Design a protein around this ligand. Structure first.
Ligand SMILES: [Cl-]
Ligand SMILES: [Cl-]
Ligand SMILES: [Zn+2]
Ligand SMILES: [Zn+2]
Lengths: 8, 187, 187, 8
């Protein structure tokens, strides 16, 4: 299980 | 897939794209189980992007792609509650995670008579959101390997299929699609 | 199909039909083994017409179709070395025969490094000639079950794919296509 | 192995 984030 | 109706549904979905009207081809055939239709297409989008990423994986290395990028503006991270991954490390976690879901009998029952779980549309969304990123990283970072290998139409046509599909059944939000909304709108 | 390049070639072929330009989608990708490309598409046309015939097989019975018909003008027979069989008997022989070929390691090697036999284009032709007839019998004799089941676009788009494919690589002669040359030229 | 014929 992965918790994914994105950044700008 | 045992010559089952579910297998027919996959063949049905693939054949009907040849009309080139993807917007109609991706709709629920009348009287069909929604979950089943989404399931079948989710599985096929996975195999598709898997083979797609597979064609350029020699160009995607720890060196070439130190971070998980979608162009300069956009960068992804995994965590367990920030483990930074190279793109091929990130994508390995993503696809392994996705495979694992598809291999979970509680989520994608291999038995055609077993109903999908109550939250199935939710797991399908999460999967498809994540599969988007592999498309995004290919476009923004390896479109030239893709050109020289001549798997550009394959990538383009697979991605067009994916978008129309996912917009039809509300499987991906607008924020997720942002690193490719240029390419999208072009359609 | 093991995540092999051959499996990729199948996904490649299916995705690229979504452009709807079947005439280009069916051409040999540059540098690709001809035999392999034909093999992959032959196998998929078999699964396709198999699932297709499968949707209306309750409507195809010993009583409904006493002979192997392609409309009034055209009628097929099997013989060994003249055995009128009912359409479902004829089609069972045909598809079993075709399956058997695809299951023959000497003809369709399951091992990606093994060259196809010298006469491979010849066996592919014979198969595709025969697969035509199942399309022909469906159109001329069960198009109404097909309509009510809503597998008409599936049938039409599969058949359009098949024709363009087979014309591209010279796999079926003009005489064989005659019981459907109306529908054909229509697209 | 089948030998196939057609008529009209
Ligand atoms: Cl995520
Ligand atoms: Cl024959
Ligand atoms: Zn990369
Ligand atoms: Zn019949």
């Amino acid at each position: 299980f992965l918790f994914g984030s994105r950044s700008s």
